[PDB]
Design a protein around this ligand. Structure first.
Ligand SMILES: Nc1ncnc2c1ncn2[C@@H]1O[C@H](COS(=O)(=O)NC(=O)[C@@H](N)CC(=O)O)[C@@H](O)[C@H]1O
Ligand SMILES: Nc1ncnc2c1ncn2[C@@H]1O[C@H](COS(=O)(=O)NC(=O)[C@@H](N)CC(=O)O)[C@@H](O)[C@H]1O
Lengths: 332, 336
């Protein structure tokens, strides 16, 4: 069971499972919609679009209803979060997994939406996509939005012969500017994926936003991590203390006794608490010299631009030579 | 309900060993640290300062291995009767693979603290079956100025040192505060707010109490260091200094894990400095939305959290909670 590839003229349904961004950042929201409309995709606005309930878009029931309406709509080919926040996991008991399994669609987003991407995969076995959310990703100004868009097409729309090589972008940024309105150009940071621990691994890739995983761990909505899986994790806009807790959470759960390799995303606006340590160095301390191939600063996180990564399919990573290939089909 | 290994009661003149499993508070808040030690020394206890006392590694007291060594030296020391965290932070869970649980099992002690120290309290209980205590940490709890420190000390003594007939009634404190003042130095008196517990959903429950700091539980969940929640348990949870979005996440985390299908009742701590995000909702109101149509007896604003004063609560022993009448009784021995 796999979702159909996106096509020009398709409808993308958008929903707000957590923060009410369509109310609080209307300019970036409108820009994001226009960007995709111009590319050739229709936008179906979920029922909580424009609504405000302070830290969230609406009640648990209303958010589940918003998403379920899109799941059940045969005219929708792709379901995309508007943004994350903290509260997507509240929806999980109430989602119509059977409707999704009977008519698979592309489910895409990142950050807090991890709860839903992993929950849908766990319940249905259908691959989901760690990738753009409407407002942060497609509301981005030039130049980075165009790079994110190229990666979006590469994974969801283009015919891709396997293995599918995921290529490193030339430049990136995590600069905290140009949210609603553009005031200057973001700096172009020359890119590098980091060969932290050499080696190669092949296996099913599982993961997403690590902070968010801790809100679903142990539940029926968290796919079981199996011996030989590849772990993909990122955090964004946290600090050294928080990520040490999260890395140790994985360690004490035996995750590093099972996975064959680790892909670690860049950490947007990382606060190192004065230590001058990088996120991978904190992970290395937690690993205590266990030799697991580890490739870091992967561009699939809150930094721009963003790759669209299938979750739940076989991948091969090479931490030595800094490559990632998708080995198993993820769409029709 | 067979008799089981229990730690020995605290006695006057006992040595309390202190360690810093996360934040380096003994370096960054020296006045409150000195005041806290001085408070317990005046009551006639001795303080053995762990090896990371006074040390500084930014967000933590030292490396993972340095912090495990610090705690293990106290665990292995037969002259220590009580092991108390200086403060929490975020990183206690890093220590868990490296703790000498065998040595603890061989010579049990009172293990006490709160907040991030939940990782260790629950880890020790999960690995050894010895009850541990959600209660004072040295600097936040015993560095508090009068009057609240005396109430916290009263509860500590009554639970850990005094003989208690069972069932043991946990008395409601008469006053409380969560004011963000008087940390290192006193500038005014904290308001003495008249206290109440809240009967959120009526009813009674009896069972083993399991829990602690909910945010911290998410850093150990699923591991050998989290005790399994069983049918009929009473869930004790608190969060401190968080916001509505964060606690909804944490309550839903419990829900989707089936915790509310198992527990017979819930005790919710006060929420120090809660940020309601403009909603004007109370933490229990958010929890009740997560509970949806499921009725569970619930007693809220319990004084076992970051607000002052603090009760000392044994974890892993049977309790009766009466949410209707706002009582908590401990039903099984927690020390000998
Ligand atoms: N007001 C604003 N201004 C500028 N940038 C913003 C913004 N709001 C969002 N962004 C940007 O959009 C990204 C995604 O936002 S997010 O709400 O979905 N985040 C999460 O769900 C995880 N934190 C969940 C977790 O950490 O557990 C942020 O990292 C910023 O880059
Ligand atoms: N610098 C300071 N100034 C004033 N009060 C302070 C303080 N530092 C601490 N406090 C007080 O001491 C309490 C406990 O701090 S703590 O580091 O142990 N917290 C935790 O481990 C959890 N947050 C882990 C989690 O939520 O995941 C705080 O709530 C304050 O009331």
């Amino acid at each position: 069971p796999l979702p159909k590839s996106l096509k020009y003229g398709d409808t993308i349904g958008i929903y707000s499972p957590s923060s009410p961004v369509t109310y609080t950042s209307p300019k970036r929201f409108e820009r994001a919609k226009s960007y995709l409309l111009q590319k050739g995709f229709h936008i179906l606005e979920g029922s909580l679009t424009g609504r405000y309930d302070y830290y969230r878009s609406g009640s648990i029931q209303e958010r589940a209803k918003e998403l379920n309406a899109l799941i059940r709509n045969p005219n929708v080919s792709c379901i995309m979060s508007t943004i994350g926040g903290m509260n997507s996991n509240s929806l999980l008991p109430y989602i119509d997994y059977d409707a999704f399994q009977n008519n698979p669609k592309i489910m895409i987003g990142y950050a807090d939406a991890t709860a839903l991407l992993l929950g849908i995969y766990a319940k249905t076995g259908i691959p989901t996509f760690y990738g753009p959310a409407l407002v942060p990703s497609f509301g981005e100004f030039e130049p980075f939005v165009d790079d994110t868009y190229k990666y979006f097409l590469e994974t969801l729309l283009h015919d891709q012969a396997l293995p599918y090589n995921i290529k490193q972008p030339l430049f990136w940024s995590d600069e905290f500017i140009n949210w609603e309105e553009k005031t200057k150009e973001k700096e172009l940071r020359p890119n590098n994926w980091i060969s932290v621990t050499n080696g190669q691994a092949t296996g099913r890739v599982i993961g997403g936003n690590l902070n968010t995983i801790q809100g679903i761990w142990g539940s029926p909505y968290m796919p079981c991590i199996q011996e030989g899986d590849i772990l993909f994790i990122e955090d964004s806009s946290k600090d050294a203390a928080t990520i040490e807790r999260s890395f140790s959470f994985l360690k004490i759960n035996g995750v590093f006794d099972k996975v064959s390799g680790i892909i670690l995303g860049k950490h947007e606006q990382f606060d190192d608490c004065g230590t001058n340590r990088k996120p991978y160095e904190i992970l290395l301390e937690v690993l205590q010299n266990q030799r697991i191939p580890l490739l870091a600063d992967f561009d699939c996180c809150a930094t721009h631009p963003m790759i669209t990564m299938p979750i739940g399919v076989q991948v091969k990573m090479d931490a030595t030579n800094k490559t990632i290939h998708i080995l198993e089909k993820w769409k029709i």
